[PDB]
Amino acid sequence: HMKILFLDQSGKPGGAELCLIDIAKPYRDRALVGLFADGAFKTLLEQHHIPVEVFTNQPIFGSLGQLAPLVAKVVQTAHEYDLIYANTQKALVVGAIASFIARRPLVYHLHDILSPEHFSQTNLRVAVNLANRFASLVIANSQASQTAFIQAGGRAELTKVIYNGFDINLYKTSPSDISKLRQQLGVANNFVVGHFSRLSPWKGQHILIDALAQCPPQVTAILVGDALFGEQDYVKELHQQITRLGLENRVKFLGFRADIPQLMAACDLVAHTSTAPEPFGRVIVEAMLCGKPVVAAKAGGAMELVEHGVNGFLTTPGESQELANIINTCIEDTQKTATIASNAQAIASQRFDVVTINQQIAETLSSL
Amino acid sequence: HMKILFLDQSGKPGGAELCLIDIAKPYRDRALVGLFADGAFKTLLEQHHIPVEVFTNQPFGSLGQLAPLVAKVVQTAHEYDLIYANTQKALVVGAIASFIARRPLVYHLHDILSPEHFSQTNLRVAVNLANRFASLVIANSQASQTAFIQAGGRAELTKVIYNGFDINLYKTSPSDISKLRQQLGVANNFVVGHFSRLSPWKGQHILIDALAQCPPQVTAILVGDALFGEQDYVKELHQQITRLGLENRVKFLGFRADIPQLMAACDLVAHTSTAPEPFGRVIVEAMLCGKPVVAAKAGGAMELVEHGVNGFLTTPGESQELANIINTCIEDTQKTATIASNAQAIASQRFDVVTINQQIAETLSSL
Numbered sequence: 001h002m003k004i005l006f007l008d009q010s011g012k013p014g015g016a017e018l019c020l021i022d023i024a025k026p027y028r029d030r031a032l033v034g035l036f037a038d039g040a041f042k043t044l045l046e047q048h049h050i051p052v053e054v055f056t057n058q059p060i061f062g063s064l065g066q067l068a069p070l071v072a073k074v075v076q077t078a079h080e081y082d083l084i085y086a087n088t089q090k091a092l093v094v095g096a097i098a099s100f101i102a103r104r105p106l107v108y109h110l111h112d113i114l115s116p117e118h119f120s121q122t123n124l125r126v127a128v129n130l131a132n133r134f135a136s137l138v139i140a141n142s143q144a145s146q147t148a149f150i151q152a153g154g155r156a157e158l159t160k161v162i163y164n165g166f167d168i169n170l171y172k173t174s175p176s177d178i179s180k181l182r183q184q185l186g187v188a189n190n191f192v193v194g195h196f197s198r199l200s201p202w203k204g205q206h207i208l209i210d211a212l213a214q215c216p217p218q219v220t221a222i223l224v225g226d227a228l229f230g231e232q233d234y235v236k237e238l239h240q241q242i243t244r245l246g247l248e249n250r251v252k253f254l255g256f257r258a259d260i261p262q263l264m265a266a267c268d269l270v271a272h273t274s275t276a277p278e279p280f281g282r283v284i285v286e287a288m289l290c291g292k293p294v295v296a297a298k299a300g301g302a303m304e305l306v307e308h309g310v311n312g313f314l315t316t317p318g319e320s321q322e323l324a325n326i327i328n329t330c331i332e333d334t335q336k337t338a339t340i341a342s343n344a345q346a347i348a349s350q351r352f353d354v355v356t357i358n359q360q361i362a363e364t365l366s367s368l
Numbered sequence: 369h370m371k372i373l374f375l376d377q378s379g380k381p382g383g384a385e386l387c388l389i390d391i392a393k394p395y396r397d398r399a400l401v402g403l404f405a406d407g408a409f410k411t412l413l414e415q416h417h418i419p420v421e422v423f424t425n426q427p428f429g430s431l432g433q434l435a436p437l438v439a440k441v442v443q444t445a446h447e448y449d450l451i452y453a454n455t456q457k458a459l460v461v462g463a464i465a466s467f468i469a470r471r472p473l474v475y476h477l478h479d480i481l482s483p484e485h486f487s488q489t490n491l492r493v494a495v496n497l498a499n500r501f502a503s504l505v506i507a508n509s510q511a512s513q514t515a516f517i518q519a520g521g522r523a524e525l526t527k528v529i530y531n532g533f534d535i536n537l538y539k540t541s542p543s544d545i546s547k548l549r550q551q552l553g554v555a556n557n558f559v560v561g562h563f564s565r566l567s568p569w570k571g572q573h574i575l576i577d578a579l580a581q582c583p584p585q586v587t588a589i590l591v592g593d594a595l596f597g598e599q600d601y602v603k604e605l606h607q608q609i610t611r612l613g614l615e616n617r618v619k620f621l622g623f624r625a626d627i628p629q630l631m632a633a634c635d636l637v638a639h640t641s642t643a644p645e646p647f648g649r650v651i652v653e654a655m656l657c658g659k660p661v662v663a664a665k666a667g668g669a670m671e672l673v674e675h676g677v678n679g680f681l682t683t684p685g686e687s688q689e690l691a692n693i694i695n696t697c698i699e700d701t702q703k704t705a706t707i708a709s710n711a712q713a714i715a716s717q718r719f720d721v722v723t724i725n726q727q728i729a730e731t732l733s734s735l
């Protein structure tokens with residue numbers, strides 16, 4: 001049973017970090033998760049009985065540590081573990097360094113699409129070179145990510161695609177609880193479109209909002225998720241968009257919620273609307289596992305998760321009218337829509353069961 | 369005429385840093401010296417009209433949050449043609465900026481990269497970054513070159529280029545000599561001057577042991593600064609001094625800028641490092657002041673001095689062997705003065721800043 005030091009730059013519970021809980025959990029006995037900032041994510045790992053430590057760049061190897069204490073601390077810690085598992089870009093930088101100095105093999109779990117759209121040239125160059133030189137293995141969360149890695153100059157022979165896994169039990173809610181929650185929200189007699197991405201222009205909440213202007217008034221949207229600071233302009237732009245379309249009573253922000261399965265159960269349609277390619281899209285799968293019909297943007301790993309008209313729908317990114325037509329089709333073809341949504345659950349529960357992903361990972365790890 | 373970004377970790381004017389003034393001065397029109405800390409060295413560069421900027425780690429890539437200084441240096445480097453790294457930390461940073469800004473890197477090596485001077489990590493880092501990113505590794509001594517290579521460095525990257533010196537600075541009036549010896553209260557002493565920062569490996573404590581084995585008109589001046597945290601060493605010297613009844617024969621002058629003058633005021637200059645010296649600027653300085661110099665037999669000292677010809681050499685750690693040389697300088701005044709006088713002629717050939725500067729410029733243009 002390996003000793004694994006996991007590293008993640010964020011103290012916040014984003015996709016990558018949510019995914020790491022499931023990645024790490026089977027190793028929680030002899031493992032540790034290193035965060036480069038404190039926040040909600042630490043609590044989760046605590047709540048999941050995973051050892052976590054927050055590293056800082058405060059002072060206290062060699063003298064070179066004064067340049068970057070965080071790195072020195074991590075390098076020091078790395079001596080105690082058999083493996084460095086880096087879950088984000090910054091964690092790859094630090095984990096490369098500590099891989100070399102502490103003489104421990106390094107795994108890069110890639111949750112991003114390394115394209116010019118998504119990141120600066122510099123970030124692409126660094127990640128590719130550090131991975132190519134120091135990573136024993138690059139686990140990609142999707143083929144779209146693997147492909148982007150390769151096109152940015154990454155070494156194909158290092159890559160292995162492994163999708164996110166999910167606890168299937170967590171995705172079932174009582175139909176009373178659904179009635180309760182729809183009530184509490186004041187949407188019980190609406191057609192509820194749920195959007196579950198953190199608030200950020202490229203997640204395209206503003207595309208959905210534009211689409212409501214072409215839907216009948218019983219169609220309402222809940223926007224769930226927070227804004228990561230820097231994107232507070234976007235939060236303004238949404239409310240100014242709503243005001244400008246008279247949608248004040250049809251769009252609700254709940255901010256960041258821990259009760260996503262329940263909320264998905266309370267929706268009628270889950271919508272993924274990213275205007276830039278999505279590496280994976282946890283929400284897409286999550287919807288499918290909650291028996292809900294999902295529409296998604298046709299790019300990135302979304303196209304791997306959904307086939308249009310069989311287990312979900314797919315629309316041109318940034319095209320609100322197209323999204324509207326799907327919402328309206330859902331309203332009418334009740335029988336079809338529910339078939340698609342029930343198939344989606346069956347199919348998705350095969351690919352993405354956390355049990356099958358965890359063994360796909362452990363097999364991958366022990367083979368080096 | 370290339371724009372050069374010189375980098376140096378220190379704000380204090382140590383040996384490598386003083387060396388850098390002479391390295392950089394001919395390029396000051398289009399160059400910049402970036403320091404990772406502020407201090408007197410900045411002032412010096414200002415006084416020599418060499419542009420200088422202090423970088424901090426206060427808040428390219430989002431990655432720059434990991435190490436802001438690195439991000440600033442990387443940014444700055446887009447405006448220059450070459451990056452010239454003069455210390456170990458400056459190599460780390462400069463390697464990173466070399467990659468990201470796609471600018472060639474030169475590493476000026478002033479250390480002896482051996483397990484005695486540095487941690488394994490420090491060796492491994494410098495060698496690996498140098499091997500991978502440096503177009504050229506300029507060593508200050510064959511001793512330094514060798515230790516690089518023995519630690520894994522790439523022989524074919526190395527070129528030994530010795531420190532240079534302005535010859536016009538190393539001359540003093542007999543009258544000025546007398547005043548200074550007077551001010552110091554040593555006019556009828558045999559004066560041994562030790563011109564090194566106060567760290568155990570500079571071996572002031574060895575000279576002190578030697579004094580007790582010297583004739584009684586012999587006194588020492590220790591010229592140099594102590595770091596905070598090597599104050600425990602300074603206390604030991606003072607205790608040692610007292611233990612040997614030498615309170616009135618050893619005086620500390622702290623850091624001083626009038627080095628040529630103070631060397632002139634000495635009768636002997638003594639280099640006593642207990643660990644191999646990469647180069648030893650004070651040894652050459654002494655020779656350029658026409659004084660007899662005794663040095664420790666190790667590192668790049670052995671390249672500067674042949675024992676009995678232009679100076680003396682002694683077994684590191686061995687005080688008694690140092691005494692014999694002092695005694696000898698006292699007894700054979702004419703021999704010594706010839707050795708001392710030869711030393712100046714010999715050293716003024718090799719280490720003339722002019723000839724070293726040419727040596728550097730031909731190395732740099734050939735790229």
Ligand SMILES: O=c1ccn([C@@H]2O[C@H](COP(=O)(O)OP(=O)(O)O)[C@@H](O)[C@H]2O)c(=O)[nH]1
Binds near residue numbers: 196282286
């Ligand atoms: O307010 C929110 C928004 C999202 N999520 C969860 O976090 C994931 C969001 O990650 P996704 O892959 O959708 O986008 P990312 O954040 O990874 O770019 C989803 O699966 C949700 O279950 C959440 O708990 N609260």
Ligand SMILES: O=c1ccn([C@@H]2O[C@H](COP(=O)(O)OP(=O)(O)O)[C@@H](O)[C@H]2O)c(=O)[nH]1
Binds near residue numbers: 624627649651
């Ligand atoms: O009190 C002092 C001691 C030294 N120096 C100068 O700093 C250099 C010391 O460098 P050296 O190579 O002797 O020792 P390092 O500190 O470089 O190891 C000499 O050339 C001196 O000119 C000085 O200005 N004041």
Ligand SMILES: OC[C@H]1O[C@H](O)[C@H](O)[C@@H](O)[C@@H]1O
Binds near residue numbers: 111
């Ligand atoms: O599984 C990893 C998840 O988070 C990652 O950061 C990606 O951005 C997202 O596409 C994916 O759904």
Ligand SMILES: OC[C@H]1O[C@H](O)[C@H](O)[C@@H](O)[C@@H]1O
Binds near residue numbers: 387478531649
């Ligand atoms: O190269 C100039 C000086 O640099 C180094 O720091 C050495 O410690 C010293 O021996 C050398 O003379």
